[PDB]
Amino acid sequence: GTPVEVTALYATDGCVITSSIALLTNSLLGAEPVYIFSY
């Protein structure tokens, strides 16, 4: 049908900003699993 829109508030064990930046830059050295606390 049509895509369902989801807003996910997420967290990580460690520095969330550093992990997000590593994910965005494709530099897979600081990326860690993301836990979706709320949606």
UniProtKB/Swiss-Prot annotation:
Domain of life of the organism encoding this protein: Viruses
Q: Where in the cell is it found?
A: Host nucleus
Similarity comment: family membership:
Belongs to the herpesviridae DNA primase family.
Its job: Essential component of the helicase/primase complex. Unwinds the DNA at the replication forks and generates single-stranded DNA for both leading and lagging strand synthesis. The primase initiates primer synthesis and thereby produces large amount of short RNA primers on the lagging strand that the polymerase elongates using dNTPs.
Describe, as the record does, how this protein assembles with itself and its partners: Associates with the helicase and the primase-associated factor to form the helicase-primase factor.
Protein name per UniProt:
DNA primase
Q: Which organism is it from?
A: Human herpesvirus 1 (strain 17)
**Lineage of the organism:** Viruses, Duplodnaviria, Heunggongvirae, Peploviricota, Herviviricetes
Q: Which residues of the full protein are shown?
A: 15 to 53 of 1058
